[PDB]
């Protein structure tokens, strides 16, 4: 996250840090708890990942330093990637993680509500992006979870900033015309959380962007509301 600050512990109880143990354990991507054994994240996060066995999901984490060999984690039973996904910039950058065991909800770990199709019209003015990602273009994974408040921009406006791309309605963007605040490498798969009427909804999933926090280069996120049907179909046993 660029231009953000340290989060308060428990401030984003739905945020998880997805690690890979190959070759050695490290943070791989962000993610969101949406159900007792379901994590919503980005599809591009699993490039080169052949098996769910090298994955580990940590919940209730503020600092990566908290994660050690003796820290409990959730194993991943199955990686479900949208069948139309090819790459981040083409859309469909969404994936589900079915955990081997269920998450016991508590103040430090609980689910975020999916957006409602009835809310496509509501306007969010209180949206935040979080993660342990880069704070600069050539940086490293950060220890303390970062947060940054960022305004949503219309798709018409976003498209004007990405003339070489096709910004579809299944994508949503957020950023400051002047830049300064944005998600970045390492934050991928993490949530774009917007609070409306005292309730938080998972509006987007950090997906891509030209560089990070650059002027007139809005961050691009998966428009979650467009996938609520896909999510229901994929999580329904």
UniProtKB/Swiss-Prot annotation:
Disulfide bonds join 29-45, 127-194, 158-173, 184-212. Changing residue 124 to H: In FA11D; transfected cells contain reduced amount of mutant protein and display decreased secretion. Changing residue 200 to S: In FA11D; mutant is not secreted by transfected fibroblasts; dominant-negative effect. Heparin binds at residues 160-163. Transmembrane segments: none annotated. It comes from the Eukaryota. Residues 1-236 form the Peptidase S1 domain. The active site is at 44 (charge relay system), 93 (charge relay system), 188 (charge relay system). Glycans are attached at residues 63, 104. This is Coagulation factor XIa light chain. It comes from Homo sapiens. The gene is F11. The chain holds residues 388 to 624 of 625 of the full protein.
